């Protein structure tokens, strides 16, 4: 036998295709695992993985988060890639030109982009123009802005929000939530 | 412990700045191999001086061969041993043809008569009893009487097949 020093038959724990069942998604993956095998360009390698990402690890990048990234020094002409949906954002009043390459554009976003005379490209059109991902600026959305993660790590002195249905005074604000009622948190 | 060789072992207290060239001690050691021999050396040495292997060095190991390996000899043997209930000095006499044969059967004898295993025995001295009549134990003296002869009565020949067609005979 072998004094093992490591758990045997361990799965690497990384998605290795998407769990998604979409033809088109699978084709984009067909495209990119080819590019990733034959182009030593790191970008293709990153994109291939992002396609496997479940909906949660794909938060929506906004058009305003897009516009900001372009105010990066020396970055205003880059084509931003977003492996996920791209949402609109009325809060920005002035939007740049550029070229966003993404999985989905909401109606409002694709308009705002095109209204200022930009381009909305699908990832495969992106490939044909930038097979080594040249001149691309990859953005990801806020993963930990999810409502769920509020409640992660709930316990004393952690400050994390009860899993609670109804809220108001007299919903979990008394004994153990204030010095004058037993104790606090 | 097996079939012994005799070794001169030499060791000496690892040198130091204020004492380069420490003093060098020798032991003759009956062991079956040089590895056991070096062990035994350190064993008795820490029983005599302030050293241990850690802080000391074996300097030279050499097998000593019998001087006259086909000369019959009367060996006086001195031993320290542990019994179940105490420890005991003791003198035996062994007749053989080399100090190495002699120590083989001593260990044999000590084991057979006193139930002494190797761990529990200490050779004090083995030396050739030169002049007969300084031989003291009878079971040896017996074999010095002039013109010695004896029969070897009741001969048992080993059969090589299971069955025999004769009925044997122990004439000899």
């Amino acid at each position: 036998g072998i004094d093992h020093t490591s758990k045997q038959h361990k799965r690497s724990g990384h998605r290795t295709a998407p769990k998604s069942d979409n033809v088109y998604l699978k084709l984009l993956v067909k495209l990119y695992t080819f590019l990733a095998r034959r182009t030593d360009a790191p970008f293709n390698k990153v994109v291939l993985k992002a396609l496997f990402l479940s909906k949660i690890n794909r938060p929506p990048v906004s058009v305003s988060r897009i516009a900001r990234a372009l105010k990066q020094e020396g970055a205003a002409n880059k084509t931003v890639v977003v492996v996920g949906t791209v949402t609109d954002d009325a809060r920005i009043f002035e939007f740049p030109k550029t070229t966003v390459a993404a999985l989905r554009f909401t109606a409002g976003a694709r308009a705002k982009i095109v209204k200022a005379g930009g381009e909305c490209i699908t990832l495969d059109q992106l490939a044909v123009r930038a097979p080594k991902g040249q001149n691309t600026l990859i953005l990801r959305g806020p993963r930990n802005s999810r409502e769920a993660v509020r409640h992660f790590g709930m316990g004393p002195h952690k400050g994390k929000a009860p899993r609670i249905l109804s809220t108001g005074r007299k919903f979990e604000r008394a004994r153990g939530r204030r010095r004058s009622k037993g104790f606090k948190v | 412990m097996a079939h012994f060789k005799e070794y001169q072992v030499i060791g000496r207290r690892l040198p130091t700045e204020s004492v380069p060239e420490p003093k060098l001690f020798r032991m003759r050691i009956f062991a079956s191999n040089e590895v056991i021999a070096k062990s035994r050396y350190w064993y008795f040495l820490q029983k005599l001086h302030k050293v241990k292997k850690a802080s000391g060095e074996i300097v030279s190991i050499n097998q000593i061969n019998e001087a006259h390996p086909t000369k019959v000899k009367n060996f006086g043997v001195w031993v320290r041993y542990d019994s179940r209930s105490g420890t005991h000095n003791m003198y035996k006499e062994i007749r053989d043809v080399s100090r190495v044969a002699a120590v083989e059967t001593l260990y044999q004898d000590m084991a057979a008569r006193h139930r002494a295993r190797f761990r529990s025995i200490h050779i004090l001295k083995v030396a050739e009893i030169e002049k007969t009549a300084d031989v003291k134990r009878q079971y040896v003296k017996q074999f010095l009487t002039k013109d010695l002869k004896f029969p070897l009565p009741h001969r048992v020949q080993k059969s090589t097949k299971t069955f025999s067609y004769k009925r044997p005979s122990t004439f000899y």
Partner: protein
């Protein structure tokens, strides 16, 4: 039934060192601490205020704070299968600067030297540490020192 108060089990831990009771000598107070200093901890039983708990006796930690009569020491204490961060408010009588680093610091200062001393000569350095190598060959002489031969000794009783 059982008892488990704060200084329980500490009879000889906090106890005072033979012939060394009394005032603490003044240098214990002239010593000076800054954040990041590594300190070893040992309780002075004569100083009851601001005293480490026994678990931190014998323990080494890093300074994180300095107050009028005290320093704050962080220690990692492992509770469970995990360490947690502990902050200790100690009075200066229970802390001393650690030497646990003096060999490092001395070695860096020197490693910087042997390097400059090398570099601006013609390289060849070798300044990592190395374990005890086994020793080399050697010729021991007999001249003045022939081997003395010992044997083992008989049983005796002196008593």
């Amino acid at each position: 039934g059982k008892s488990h108060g704060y200084r329980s089990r500490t009879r000889y831990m906090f106890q005072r060192d033979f012939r060394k009771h009394g005032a603490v000598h003044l240098s214990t107070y002239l010593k000076v601490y800054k954040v990041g200093d590594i300190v070893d901890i040992k309780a002075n039983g004569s100083i009851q205020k601001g005293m480490p708990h026994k678990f931190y006796q014998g323990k080494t930690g890093v300074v994180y704070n300095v107050t009028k009569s005290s320093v704050g020491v962080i220690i990692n204490k492992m509770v469970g299968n995990r360490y947690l961060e502990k902050r200790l408010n100690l009075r200066v009588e229970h802390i001393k600067h650690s030497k646990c680093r003096q060999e490092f610091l001395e070695r860096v200062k020197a490693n910087a030297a042997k390097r400059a001393e090398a570099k601006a000569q013609g390289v060849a350095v070798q300044l990592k540490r190395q374990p005890a190598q086994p020793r080399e060959s050697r010729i021991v002489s007999t001249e003045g020192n022939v081997p003395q031969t010992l044997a083992p000794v008989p049983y005796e009783t002196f008593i």
